[PDB]
Design goal:
Order of helices and strands of chain B: H
Structural class of chain A: alpha/beta
Keywords: colchicine binding domain, tubulin inhibitor, tublin, structural protein
CATH class of the largest domain in chain A: Alpha Beta
CATH class of chain B: Special
Strand order of the largest sheet of chain A: 5-4-1-6-7-8-9-12-10-11
CATH architecture of chain B: Helix non-globular
Shape of chain A: globular
PDB class: structural protein
Helix content of chain B: over 70%
Distance between the termini of chain A: 36 Å
Distance between the termini of chain B: 102 Å
Oligomer: part of a larger assembly
Chain A: Tubulin beta chain
Helix content of chain A: 40-55%
CATH architecture of the largest domain in chain A: 3-Layer(aba) Sandwich
Number of strands of chain B: 0
Strand content of chain A: 15-25%
Number of helices of chain B: 1
CATH topology of chain B: Methane Monooxygenase Hydroxylase, Chain G, domain 1
Largest interface: A-B, 12 and 10 residues
Bound molecules: guanosine-5'-diphosphate, magnesium ion
Organism of A: Sus scrofa
Largest sheet of chain A: 10 strands, mixed
Entry title: Crystal structure of apo T2R-TTL
Order of helices and strands of chain A: EHEEEHEHHEHEHEHHHHEHEHEEHHH
Structural class of chain B: mainly alpha
Largest sheet of chain B: none
Number of helices of chain A: 15
CATH superfamily of the largest domain in chain A: Tubulin/FtsZ, GTPase domain
Shape of chain B: rod-shaped
CATH topology of the largest domain in chain A: Rossmann fold
Chain lengths: 428, 67
């Protein structure tokens, strides 16, 4: 299986989504025209995973852009790689979702969703062998969160044997738009637990902290946060995009990473951590990459890895380096810290190497972990949800769109089940 | 799930229509009760003045029937 269909929803979804296509396009040698101007053949070998060929010979991203507002999509279209997207893959309403999950999922989103599925079907039909879908969205707003999870439900109904994966941005009070973000996040998680196969948890708390503590940026913008996201995203999709042995498609990644169907929320990690523009001149040694990629301070989800156990780990090393030194360092980490890797999944750490480094670095490592420490992320959202929900505060925004309190109670309970299910395996 | 989604949007339409309905009806009862009360307050004033003309007729009557 080859083709992945990419969907980006809402302001956050479309902003990280645009950056993703920007970064991977440069790696595959594709320019704003859709014209290849690269040297290596490794660049084109698996280009069909993400790109359509339309005679030119031009490469068109298999990408559908979705919003309930036109704003951020006009931003994308007049942005750097804006011309590359298929204009018919732009699907927008006018009325917005007002950071309201109920509007995205039930009222405004319901009005727009069929048009999105027409574009999904049109893209799915040109595929030799569709692998499945990736979605970029946030959980804190209304469109990416409410409408994004509506879309996932409808995509699963029409394609139940395909893999569904998400890059899901979790909200934090540190970088926050509205007080209702915990409501929107809890309702979205409930969906994600049932209808995705694999979810990369991108924690805005973590991205903020990395920017503040490590990159010495005193006031991080979304741009700074998204630079970390696009690097992580390029990293986690390396094995899908380039010639390679393991985690080479979406189903094989799921089979190695997900021991129990509900526990499919991954903590990504990246090394070296770099800020935008400002370059680093000294390449990292393989021992340094390996130490940094496993460091809590390189994690994109604000969870302490020492507070849990790793179920499974995938590690991707990028650049020209010694594969023998990689195996040794990877083996050294596990042997040194063996109590943090569950002993009932043997050889639960898999490593891949790709020759092509990302732009502006000679060496990089990407970490994908399924840790039971992710539970800290869900506990945090749960705490914020309950603080409001016990006084039913802000609920009228949701009941006004037809929702009952019961739906909140159920979504909370399911998220608490997920928490305690993680705790079960951290002690087994 | 699709049936649940249909029910939520229907609930929302129903409650919005109920609010419009009930606001339309409370306003119409208020405008009616008010028109009636204003009218009864005026009818009573006019009646009091009617009884003054009736008393003035009767007083002029009482004058002429004395010589
Ligand atoms: N990391 C990141 N988070 C974002 C960005 N834009 C918005 N957010 C976060 O996304 C959430 C709000 O959702 P947003 O995508 O703006 O609303 P939507 O358009 O209705 O889906 C909040 O948690 C914001 O902190 C972005 O560009 N990057
Ligand atoms: Mg927003």
């Amino acid at each position: 299986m080859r083709e992945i269909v990419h969907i980006q929803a809402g302001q956050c979804g479309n902003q990280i989504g645009a950056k993703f296509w920007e970064v991977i396009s440069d790696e595959h040698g594709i320019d704003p025209t859709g014209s290849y101007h690269g040297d290596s053949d490794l660049q084109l070998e698996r280009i069909n995973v993400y790109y359509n060929e339309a005679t030119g010979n031009k490469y068109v991203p298999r990408a559908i852009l979705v919003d309930l507002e036109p704003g951020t999509m006009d931003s994308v279209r007049s942005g750097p790689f804006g011309q590359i997207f298929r204009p018919d893959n732009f699907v927008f309403g006018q009325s917005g979702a007002g950071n309201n999950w109920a509007k995205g999922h039930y009222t405004e989103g319901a009005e727009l969703v069929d048009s999105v599925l027409d574009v999904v079907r049109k893209e799915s039909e040109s595929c030799d062998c569709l692998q499945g879908f990736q979605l970029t969205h946030s959980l804190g707003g209304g469109t990416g969160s409410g409408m994004g999870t509506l879309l996932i439900s409808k995509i699963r109904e029409e394609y139940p044997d395909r893999i569904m994966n998400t890059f899901s941005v979790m909200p934090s009070p540190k970088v926050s738009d509205t007080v209702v973000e915990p409501y929107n996040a809890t309702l979205s998680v409930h969906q994600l637990v049932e209808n995705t196969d694999e979810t990369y948890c991108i924690d805005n708390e973590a991205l903020y902290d990395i920017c503040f503590r490590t990159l010495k940026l005193t006031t991080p913008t979304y741009g700074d946060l998204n630079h970390l996201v696009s690097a992580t995203m390029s990293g986690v999709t390396t094995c899908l995009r380039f010639p390679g042995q393991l985690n080479a498609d979406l189903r094989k990644l799921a089979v190695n990473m997900v021991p129990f169907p509900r526990l499919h929320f991954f903590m990504p990690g990246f090394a070296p951590l770099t800020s935008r523009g400002s370059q680093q001149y000294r390449a990292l040694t393989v021992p340094e990459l390996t130490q940094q990629m496993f460091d809590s301070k390189n994690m994109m989800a604000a969870c302490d890895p020492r507070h849990g156990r790793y179920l499974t780990v995938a590690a991707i090393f990028r650049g020209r380096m010694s594969m023998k030194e990689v195996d040794e360092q990877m083996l050294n980490v596990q042997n040194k810290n063996s109590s943090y890797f569950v002993e009932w999944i043997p050889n639960n750490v898999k490593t891949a190497v790709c020759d092509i480094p990302p732009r502006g670095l000679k060496m990089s490592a990407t970490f994908i972990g399924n840790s039971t420490a992710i539970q800290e992320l869900f506990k945090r959202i749960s705490e914020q949800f309950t603080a409001m929900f016990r006084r039913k505060a802000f609920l009228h925004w949701y009941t006004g769109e037809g929702m009952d309190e019961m739906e909140f109670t159920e979504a909370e309970s399911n998220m608490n089940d997920l928490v305690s299910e993680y705790q079960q395996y951290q002690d087994a | 799930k699709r049936e649940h989604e249909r029910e939520v949007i229907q609930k929302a339409i129903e409650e919005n229509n109920n609010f419009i309905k009930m606001a339309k009806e409370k306003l119409a009862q208020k405008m009616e009760s008010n028109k009636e009360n204003r009218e009864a307050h005026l009818a009573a004033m006019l009646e009091r003045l009617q009884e003054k003309d009736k008393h003035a007729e009767e007083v002029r009557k009482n004058k002429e029937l004395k010589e």
